[PDB]
Design a protein around this ligand. Structure first.
Ligand SMILES: *[C@@H]1O[C@H](CO)[C@@H](O[C@@H]2O[C@H](CO)[C@@H](O[C@@H]3O[C@H](CO[C@H]4O[C@H](CO)[C@@H](O)[C@H](O[C@H]5O[C@H](CO)[C@@H](O)[C@H](O)[C@@H]5O[C@H]5O[C@H](CO)[C@@H](O)[C@H](O)[C@@H]5O)[C@@H]4O)[C@@H](O)[C@H](O[C@H]4O[C@H](CO)[C@@H](O)[C@H](O)[C@@H]4O[C@H]4O[C@H](CO)[C@@H](O)[C@H](O)[C@@H]4O)[C@@H]3O)[C@H](O)[C@H]2NC(C)=O)[C@H](O)[C@H]1NC(C)=O
Ligand SMILES: O=C(c1cnc(OCC(F)(F)F)c(C2CC2)c1)N1C[C@@H]2CN(C(=O)c3ccc4[nH]nnc4c3)C[C@H]2C1
Ligand SMILES: [Ca+2]
Ligand SMILES: [Ca+2]
Ligand SMILES: [K+]
Ligand code: NA
Ligand SMILES: [Zn+2]
Length: 805
């Protein structure tokens, strides 16, 4: 109940919201049916429209007008945005040359430059180039300020998950808004676009920018707008708020445009009907900037022009129907469209089998346009698993397609020609970023980056300390003229042991064997120098990674590789090796096929054993440094140490062997040498964070050898590829992956063929950022380079996407 009889006189778009049933005059009141009786009359005036004309100049203030052209309007803060242009001979902001903004140029009483976030729904990254002729204001912002060629949304590339990610720096799995519709079983409730449930605070986790600002005494203009307030009135309201007295004026403002997404759904991303909404968004930007220039704030405000996701071509006839695959299609609930999520219709049904449902959706048709996954098997780069609102069964849908349960669902809900929500590496889902103002750089292009990073930068822009979030703070310092945050490297928590030879061979009873008893007085000095770390500067290019948790581990040196060997997990946490452009691939000699050798530096009690692998009929083993890339027949013996061994499903060994035998060498020839760091990952609770020993759900049978859920590799080289990886003088270039350690290759529909037809496609799908691997391992990489730390942070957030241009 709202007793809606009070008045909005003097309170139009009030900043503090009053407590019901007293009537509301704030920008959200429409959406609660709670506006005072006279809200439209007082607060939503439209008389005479939005522009001054010659004859309105110096008019007598008439309060009924939507905006004013009278002499007192600058003082009252409520001129039409074009007042000076029409009535004072001024120029439009877009017609002025840009001039570098070296310092903020603000009226007296401004303590900090205001931030305005101008967010545009569905604004695909290629609109910047493709609609440039019709967006002159936006093109001025872009070329004069700081811009990226595109910005990567988060998955799913839907509206609410992306807007709330912008506001929080959090992955949808952490902020809670995991889709445009959700079911939460602990609440027992659904969240929809239609209706009232979406308004309850229980959905919205994390700490959004406006709340961060408020708690630290920076005042915030309201971010949500009600859908029926027109664009011109939002702009005017922001400009009015900017005229408030110093003690009442907010420092941060948000504007939201429903376009071009709205049209894009109807006409597709490049439909001819799309030119007009681009013109209109450009015009609104023009109104804002003319408004700022009137208030003399155009060289004082930081403006962020940012999209939530792009838009792809999608029509009704590109729909795959689950009824074409399943038989009990009625025992399921599907959240449909550009992604799929499946759960049971009824929780009082114990005859519902996730495994049978998945098997029934796997490689069923040769051209199939989706792929089922248990959520914990989705590519780790999507970070889409650690929330009760995310269903166990997920369908990743091919770009340009839809999934639906039955045909009746598609025609008893072609309407649409555009949609979004797909994998966030897809080109058509990419969106825009421009920053313009005193705190951003002048005419600067920056590399593409992820939208999870902006919350930190907005906090920097406002002098706020960010709530804990998924950005890497410092990784966008190169966007800013000043206000940079000065990050420091995390302190190493555990320091390694450096064991020497401490055990005789016969102390070991591991059930391992090797054909290695064959025999020089000169090269006995050498082998010894190699075990002391004489080649270490060649294989460890960027310092050893730092272990950021408490544990027991040993540094092991070898001719061809260095490793950090964990006495707790009985395997390396990391293995580092450099492969130059010239390096040769050889094979495993026949007498050495099943060879595993005790490491006399590490006690039997902290070693794996061959017996366990013999007894475990499911589990086999592989090596982190590959024997194929040994530098000499003698150095090959090092690769067969029991301390280089890791557990591997036979099915996974097909993937790994091909990576080690064929791909490392291909990359080394292409990149002029690579440094490679590889290792296991344990993430049994799928939270994207390293597991502690007591979280491991799986061991090699009858042993304490823990089974990795994933294997990673980081492959680094010189960005200037005329320089070899081991002698690089400037910026680095990196690509990485986190391969799921699975007992089958069901994920790859062509896995019956040669590894050369499917393995690399799989690895590309599981591309990762170094930062993703740091979270999953508790390691910190690149500790000793000649690069600045901000630069290394950018490199650690890079993702190699494998899309075209
Ligand atoms: C991306 O960035 C984010 C933000 O930094 C990272 O997420 C953080 O990770 C932390 C570690 O996992 C986690 O810390 C835990 O917090 C518990 C208290 O949590 C509440 O308070 C915070 C702070 O204000 C709040 O943000 C939380 O909000 C969550 O939950 C609400 C409501 O439930 C949601 O609205 C909201 O969306 C959010 O949900 C997300 O987090 C939860 C888990 O916290 C997930 O389950 C959800 O799916 C969703 O993703 C909370 O309201 C705290 O109690 C924990 O402490 C236990 O563990 C420690 C280990 O040190 C131990 O010492 C303690 O004693 C304690 O143990 C006891 O509890 C155990 C488990 O119940 C039990 O087994 C024991 O027996 C003990 O009784 C813990 O410190 C932090 O909450 C989140 N923050 C956020 C915002 O998600 C995220 O990791 C980053 N992602 C990546 C990939 O790096
Ligand atoms: O009120 C806001 C808002 C506006 N701005 C913000 O943030 C701005 C920010 F973060 F950038 F600063 C924030 C975030 C706080 C959540 C929220 N709204 C109301 C709009 C209603 N809406 C839709 O129904 C919709 C739209 C397009 C679609 N395509 N496909 N399905 C769709 C469904 C999008 C919602 C955004
Ligand atoms: Ca959207
Ligand atoms: Ca974990
Ligand atoms: K075995
Ligand atoms: Na297969
Ligand atoms: Zn949309």
């Amino acid at each position: 109940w709202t007793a809606t009889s009070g008045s909005c006189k003097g309170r139009c778009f009030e900043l503090q919201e009053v407590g019901p049933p007293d009537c509301r005059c704030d920008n959200l009141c429409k959406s609660y049916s709670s506006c005072c009786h006279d809200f439209d009359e007082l607060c939503l005036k439209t008389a005479r429209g939005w522009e001054c004309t010659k004859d309105r100049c110096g008019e007598v203030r008439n309060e009924e007008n939507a905006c004013h052209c009278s002499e007192d309007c600058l003082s009252r803060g409520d001129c039409c945005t074009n007042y000076q242009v029409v009535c004072k001979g001024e120029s439009h902001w877009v017609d002025d040359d840009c001039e570098e903004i070296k310092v903020p140029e603000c009226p007296a009483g401004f303590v900090r430059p205001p931030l305005i976030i101008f967010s545009v729904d569905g604004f695909r990254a290629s609109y910047m180039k493709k609609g440039s002729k019709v967006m002159p204001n936006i093109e001025k912002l872009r070329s004069c300020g700081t811009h990226a060629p595109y910005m990567r949304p988060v998955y799913p590339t839907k509206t609410f998950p992306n807007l709330y990610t912008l506001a929080t720096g959090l992955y949808p799995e952490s902020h809670g808004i995991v889709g445009n519709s959700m079911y939460d079983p602990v609440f027992d409730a659904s969240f929809h676009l239609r209706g009232r449930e979406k308004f309850n605070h229980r959905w919205w986790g994390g700490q959004p920018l406006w709340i961060t600002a408020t708690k630290q005494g920076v005042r915030a203009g309201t971010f949500f707008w009600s859908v029926s307030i027109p664009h011109e009135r939002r702009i005017l309201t922001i400009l009015q708020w900017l005229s408030l007295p110093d003690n009442e004026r907010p420092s941060v403002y948000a504007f939201y445009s429903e376009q071009p997404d709205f049209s894009g759904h109807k006409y597709g991303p490049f439909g001819p009907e799309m030119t007009n909404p681009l013109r209109e968004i450009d015009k609104t930007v023009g109104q804002l900037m003319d408004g700022l220039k009137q208030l003399r704030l155009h060289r004082c405000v930081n403006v962020i022009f940012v999209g939530d996701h792009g838009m792809e071509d999608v029509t009704c006839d590109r729909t795959e129907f689950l009824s074409n695959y399943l038989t009990n299609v009625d025992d399921i609930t599907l959240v449909p469209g550009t992604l799929g999520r499946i759960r049971a219709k009824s929780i009082n049904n114990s005859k519902y089998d996730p495994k049978t449902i998945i098997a029934a959706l796997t490689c069923k048709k040769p051209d199939q346009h989706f792929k089922p996954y248990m959520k914990q098997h989705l590519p780790k780069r999507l970070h889409y698993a650690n929330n009760r609102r995310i269903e166990d069964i997920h369908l990743l849908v091919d770009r340009r397609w839809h999934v639906a349960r039955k045909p009746l669902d598609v025609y008893k809900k072609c309407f649409f020609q555009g949609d979004h929500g797909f994998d966030n590496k897809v080109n058509s889902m990419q969106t825009v970023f421009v920053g313009y103002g005193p705190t951003f750089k002048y005419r600067t292009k920056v590399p593409p980056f992820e939208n999870i990073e902006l919350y930190n930068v907005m906090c920097d822009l406002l002098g706020l300390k960010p709530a804990p979030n998924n950005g890497t703070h410092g990784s966008l310092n190169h966007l800013l003229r000043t206000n940079t945050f000065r990050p420091t490297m995390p302190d190493e928590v555990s320091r390694p042991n450096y064991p020497g030879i401490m055990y005789l061979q016969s102390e070991f009873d591991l059930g391992c064997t090797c054909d290695d008893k064959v025999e020089n007085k000169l090269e006995e000095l050498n082998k010894r120098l190699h075990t002391k770390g004489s080649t270490k500067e060649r294989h460890l290019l960027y310092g050893r990674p730092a272990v950021l948790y408490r544990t027991s581990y040993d540094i092991l040196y070898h001719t061809d590789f260095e490793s950090g060997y964990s006495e707790i997990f009985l395997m390396p946490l990391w293995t580092s090796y450099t492969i130059s452009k010239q390096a040769e691939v050889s094979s495993i000699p026949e007498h050495l096929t099943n060879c595993v050798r005790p490491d006399v530096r590490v006690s039997p009690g902290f070693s794996q054993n061959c017996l366990a692998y013999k007894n475990d009929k499911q589990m086999s083993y592989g090596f982190l440094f590959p024997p194929y890339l040994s530098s000499s027949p003698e150095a090959k013996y090092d690769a067969f140490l029991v301390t280089n061994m890791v557990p591997m499903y036979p099915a996974f060994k097909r993937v790994w062997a091909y990576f080690q035998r064929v791909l490392v060498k291909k990359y080394a020839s292409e990149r002029n040498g690579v440094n490679v760091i590889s290792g296991p990952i344990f993430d049994y609770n799928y939270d994207g964070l390293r597991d502690t020993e007591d979280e491991i759900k799986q061991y090699v049978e009858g042993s304490s050898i823990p089974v990795p859920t994933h294997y990673y590799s980081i492959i680094t080289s010189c960005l200037d590829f005329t320089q070899p990886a081991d002698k690089c003088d400037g910026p680095l270039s990196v690509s990485s992956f986190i391969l799921p350690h699975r007992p089958d290759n069901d994920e790859s529909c062509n896995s019956s063929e040669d590894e050369s037809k499917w393995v690399e496609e799989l690895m590309k799908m599981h591309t990762a950022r170094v930062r993703d691997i740091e979270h999953l391992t508790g390691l910190d990489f690149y500790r000793k380079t000649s690069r600045s730390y901000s630069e290394i942070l950018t490199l650690k957030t890079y993702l190699h996407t494998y899309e075209s241009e």
